[PDB]
Design a protein around this nucleic acid. Structure first.
Lengths: 180, 35, 201, 185, 103, 128, 147
RNA sequence: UUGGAUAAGGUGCCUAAAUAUUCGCUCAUGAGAUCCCAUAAAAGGUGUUGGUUCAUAUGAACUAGCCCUGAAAAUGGAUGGCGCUAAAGCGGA
RNA sequence: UUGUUUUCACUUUCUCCCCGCACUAAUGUGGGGAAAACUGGCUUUAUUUCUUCAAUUAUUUUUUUUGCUGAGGA
């Protein structure tokens, strides 16, 4: 396993409920899966959303479940469409973005990186709504559409990334970026 | 542990069913509101 | 770093990256000699770099420009000044590190006959995307007032001819030595043979 | 960022091409043209027995993709110029002072006199591979011909721009030399 | 030919250091062929001799050595920290040290 | 409720969590120091023995470092006494460093302060 | 519908600028990360920069996701299916003997001899030195005779 | 005082530590580059990137990232300097 | 006023047919159709040293090479 390669976004399924009172005996139980670095951040986000949508806060509520969802097939490549709400420096906008990779967590990490790089949207300004697998038929973004051809092949024009050991300072002759 | 795997499969199956049902119902609400 | 001196070919090298690597080597007490300094490349358009040098040129001490920043125009001197700016030259050790560096335009008499090294971490082909503008230090110096570019080109083509002759002679010698080896390799004892081909000699 | 984008250019009959490291050389019955495209990331697949050349770019952003058709049009301009010389018909217009054009130096270095009665000789030298003469049909016409579209068009532009009038109403003093039309031979 | 070597060559860089501040208790040493922390870890614990010449004889000899030990690696690029019995004079920055195969 | 409210006002300056049995045990064994002397004259001493634990805390039937570990891990009937008998732990900086002492642990960006829940153990292990 | 001599000749002589694409089944060599220096097979493409490499159970690289910039594609490519998995990949690798074919190219031989050269013991180092000394002696004799 | 490990902040050189890894954005004929902090606005752009809503892959209208105009001062001049564009810039991991 | 059920649409081909019939980035390709089923998935039986038995957490036991220190004198 390569920790440098591995991000640390995980999907957590969290179930909670308001503490039963005299006013109501069986409060409705709220369930949601969210993405966070760890279960503590996941619970914090769950309670934030409980307060925002329902009138239920950590103090008047109790946890019922907090587990981690693991991808069934972490080595199958699948296309994800994720709905999104984020606020900019001047307003709030919803956008739908597509990715494709093995795990929903990897897709979400991709989304965070893309949002930061393109719209300078920090993670605190992002609210993930409805990330879900989408079939190849209804993929919408062209940069994902072009990745689903019947036979995909291209060259490897990337520059070499050698080990630090062999990244020697003085070279005997000019290396070739042409490769192959 | 086959019965345990069956039991743990069903809960996750039902959770995904609930998530998909919520997705469908919000999409239907948006479609109704659009017109 | 561990040689008596390192001769490096500055052709196709980015000025700042090359200067940084050279400065670190000099500070670690390694003598280096930079040749073909007029083929150093600089990122950014030729006009942009010319504008930068004009801004540098407009800069002199009002009271007495003799004391002002001596501007220098040879690309070798430009590289030398960049290295100095990348170096603590106002201390004794920094001064020693600066004086451990020699810069030339073209390849003079000692350095055209020794191996020239290259820093792949500063090569333009590896550090600049192919769709972005770059400049040539020789042409920049010519536009600024060096007026020795063409003569260096003449000397360079002459050196190319003599180097080509030397290379052909060397290739013939290596071919004949390989022919000698492949036959004398049958005259040694078989177990010596096995060791040599096992380890790839 | 698209993965691969290509465009195909047919090779006409009477032309012979050679492409090495996006350095194209085109030869025809009207001379030889030689162009370099080493400022663009492209594969140029030259097919000879079946003619045509394909320009293909991998991982092209739209800004770079815009150059594929530019290269293709440059190549087809080279073909047309080498098979039938590009011709630029120019007209000398004048209100009161007829413009005296004299062609010297085996159809190069045209000289212009009497522009606004200035009696001071102006002149332009044709770019390499460009021929300037006068039309044998219309008396106030100039032919600028050659294989290289850029060279002949630049020479025509030089002729036009060498004879601009100064310090007068440009829209009232219309006289000068203007590219009437562009065609081939 | 003669005068066997059986040591690795190193170069004395500065002291253990920050910007604007020095701790001349550890000396930074660079190894001939080590460019990674993993490789530099191989030499930890080895004795290092800084051998230098003097202008005049001191025990009938013109040469004297300052002894030290490779304590631990420094950074990610195969530089080590060495502790000597006496602090290395800053005259010696850039000079050559033997890093011996023993212990 | 009382200590939780006290902790709430100091939250941005601390990090806390749930210690678990192994980290409680190794904290006591490795960094465990104890207030030995007579009242208000304590004179911190490393444990190294059960003699002083018996001497001061024996009347609660808690003579023994394992009894202390039990009473700490489970909020046992003798918890205030054991905690007060225990000198405040003096921890070394983390082996791999902090993320950012300035920001909350629960902030999406890297941060350190707040309630870490079960994640306090990995931090104690490199702070110990 | 068939073109025979012209297709075969021209296609063989086509000589593309870019060979060794990023198809499934392309044999690549990892040059960065914990798995650097090991061979693997591209099994499918996830993004432009990310691929999935499954060195079969015979090259010590698990089926993992790797950025494409960490790979170095080699000449060899097997005809595996885009969908295929580790077991069938091992089957076809053993069938086509692609690994053996790679360990005959200039790069493969170079890596093999380097790998068995830095494992040389002190005695083997002296053995190769002695063999080189004997070879050098013979070289000098025949060169002197050549005059 | 001796070792160890960190904070703030950094790791291209000056300067100890990454020309680290991974993902996007940006070309500036006055790019940009750490709180206090060492100025910049209204108004614009057919620069490029990503979204939203209408019209049979075209035409529109919005939106907001970086870039550009707006943007002029006196000794010569300052992201701290060198310099940096497959960043050594910007936003993340 | 929640469950429950149903429909089609989802894959690989170094397969075949028709059209462009060489048109491709391509040692192939674009469009339209057929085929089974190697590929992929599932269900059984035996095994895990051919191969895998991971990762995280809790709970335990070790290990390679080494830096610094030795207060005291019962």
């Amino acid at each position: 396993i390569d920790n440098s390669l591995n991000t640390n976004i995980h999907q957590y399924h969290i179930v909670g409920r308001a503490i039963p009172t005299a006013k109501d005996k069986n409060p409705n139980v709220y369930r949601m899966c969210i993405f966070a670095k760890n279960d503590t951040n996941a619970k914090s986000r769950f309670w934030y959303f409980m307060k925002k949508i329902n009138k239920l806060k950590k103090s008047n509520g109790e946890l019922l479940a907090c587990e981690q969802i693991k991808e069934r097939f972490p080595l199958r490549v699948k296309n994800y469409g994720v709905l999104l709400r984020y606020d900019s420096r001047t307003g709030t906008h919803n956008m739908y973005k597509e990715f494709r990779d093995t795990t929903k967590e990897g897709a979400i990490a991709q989304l965070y990186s893309e949002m930061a790089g393109r719209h300078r949207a920090r993670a605190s300004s992002i609210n993930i709504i409805r990330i879900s697998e989408i079939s190849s038929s209804l993929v919408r973004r062209p940069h994902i559409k072009q990745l689903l051809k019947r036979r995909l092949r291209f060259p490897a024009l990337h520059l070499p990334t050698l080990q630090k050991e062999y990244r020697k300072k003085f070279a005997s002759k000019r290396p070739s970026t042409y490769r192959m | 542990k086959q019965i345990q795997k069956k039991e743990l499969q069903k809960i996750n199956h039902d959770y995904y069913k609930g998530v998909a049902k919520a997705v469908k119902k919000k999409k239907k609400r948006e479609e109704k509101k659009a017109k | 770093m561990y040689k008596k001196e390192y001769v490096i070919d500055c052709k196709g090298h980015l000025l700042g990256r090359l200067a940084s690597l050279i400065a670190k080597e000099l500070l670690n007490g390694q003598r280096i000699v930079a040749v073909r300094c007029e083929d150093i490349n600089i990122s950014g358009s030729l006009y942009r770099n010319k504008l930068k040098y004009q801004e540098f040129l407009r800069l002199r001490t009002n009271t007495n420009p003799k004391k002002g920043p001596l501007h220098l125009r040879e690309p070798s001197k430009i590289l030398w000044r960049c290295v100095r700016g990348m170096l603590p030259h106002k201390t004794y050790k920094g001064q020693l590190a600066l004086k451990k560096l020699k810069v030339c335009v073209g390849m003079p008499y000692p350095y055209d006959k020794k191996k020239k090294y290259v820093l792949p971490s500063a090569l333009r082909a590896f550090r600049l995307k192919k769709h972005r503008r770059y400049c040539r230090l020789g042409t920049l110096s010519s536009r600024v007032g060096w007026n020795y570019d063409t003569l260096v080109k003449k000397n360079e083509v002459l050196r190319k001819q003599v180097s080509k002759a030397y290379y052909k002679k060397k290739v013939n010698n290596l071919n004949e030595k390989k022919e000698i080896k492949t036959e004398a390799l049958n005259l040694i004892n078989p177990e010596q043979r096995q060791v040599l081909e096992n380890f790839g000699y | 960022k698209t993965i691969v984008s290509t465009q195909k250019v047919l090779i006409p009959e009477g032309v012979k091409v050679a492409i090495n490291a996006r350095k194209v050389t085109v030869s025809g019955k009207y001379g030889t043209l030689r162009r370099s495209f080493r400022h663009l990331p492209i594969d140029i697949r030259l097919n000879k027995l079946k003619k045509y050349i394909k320009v293909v770019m991998w991982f092209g952003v739209p800004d770079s993709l815009a150059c594929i058709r530019t290269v293709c049009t440059h190549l087809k301009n080279m073909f047309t110029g080498v098979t039938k010389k590009f011709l630029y018909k120019m007209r000398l217009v004048h209100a009161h002072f007829p413009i005296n054009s004299n062609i010297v130096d085996n159809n190069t270095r045209i000289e212009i006199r009497n522009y606004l009665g200035e009696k001071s000789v102006r002149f332009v030298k044709a770019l390499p591979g460009v021929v300037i003469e006068k039309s044998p049909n219309v008396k106030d016409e100039i032919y600028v011909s050659g294989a290289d579209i850029e060279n002949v068009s630049l020479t025509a532009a030089l002729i036009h721009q060498s004879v601009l009038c100064r310090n007068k109403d440009i829209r009232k003093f219309l006289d000068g030399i203007y590219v009437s039309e562009v065609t081939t031979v | 030919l003669q005068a066997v070597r059986l040591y690795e060559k190193g170069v004395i860089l500065g002291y253990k250091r920050s910007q604007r501040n020095q701790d001349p208790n550890f000396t930074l040493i660079s190894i001939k062929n080590v460019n990674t922390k993993k490789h530099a870890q191989f030499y930890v614990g080895k004795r290092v001799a800084y051998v230098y010449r003097t202008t005049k004889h001191h025990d009938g000899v013109k040469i004297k050595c300052i002894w030290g030990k490779v304590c631990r690696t420094h950074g990610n690029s195969g530089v080590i920290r060495a502790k000597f019995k006496t602090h290395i004079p800053p005259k010696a920055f850039g000079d050559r040290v033997r890093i011996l195969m023993y212990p | 409720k009382a200590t939780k409210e006290m902790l709430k006002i100091v939250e941005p300056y601390v990090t806390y969590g749930y210690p678990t049995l192994s980290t409680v045990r190794k904290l006591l064994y490795k960094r465990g120091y104890v207030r030995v002397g007579k009242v208000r004259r304590y004179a911190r001493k490393k444990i190294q023995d059960n003699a002083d634990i018996s001497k001061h805390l024996g009347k609660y039937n808690v003579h023994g470092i394992e009894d202390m570990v039990y009473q700490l891990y489970t909020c046992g009937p003798v918890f205030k006494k054991v905690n007060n008998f225990l000198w405040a732990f003096k921890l070394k900086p983390p082996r791999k460093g902090f993320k950012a002492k300035r920001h909350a642990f629960n902030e999406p960006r890297p941060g350190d302060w707040g309630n870490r829940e079960a994640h306090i153990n990995e931090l104690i292990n490199r702070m110990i | 519908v068939e073109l025979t001599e012209e297709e075969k000749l021209y296609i063989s002589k086509k000589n593309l600028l870019f060979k060794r694409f990023v198809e499934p089944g392309r044999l690549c060599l990892i040059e960065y990360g914990p798995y650097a220096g090991k061979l693997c097979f591209i099994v499918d493409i996830v993004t432009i920069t990310r691929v999935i490499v499954d060195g079969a159970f015979i090259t010590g690289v698990p089926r993992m996701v790797i950025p494409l910039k960490r790979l170095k594609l080699l000449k060899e490519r097997i005809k595996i299916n885009k969908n295929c998995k580790s077991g069938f990949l091992r089957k076809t690798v053993n069938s086509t003997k692609v690994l053996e074919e790679f360990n005959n190219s200039k790069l493969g031989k170079k890596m093999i001899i380097k790998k068995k050269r830095d494992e040389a013991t002190d005695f083997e180092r002296f053995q190769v030195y002695f063999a080189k000394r004997e070879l050098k002696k013979k070289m000098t004799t025949i060169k002197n005779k050549k005059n």
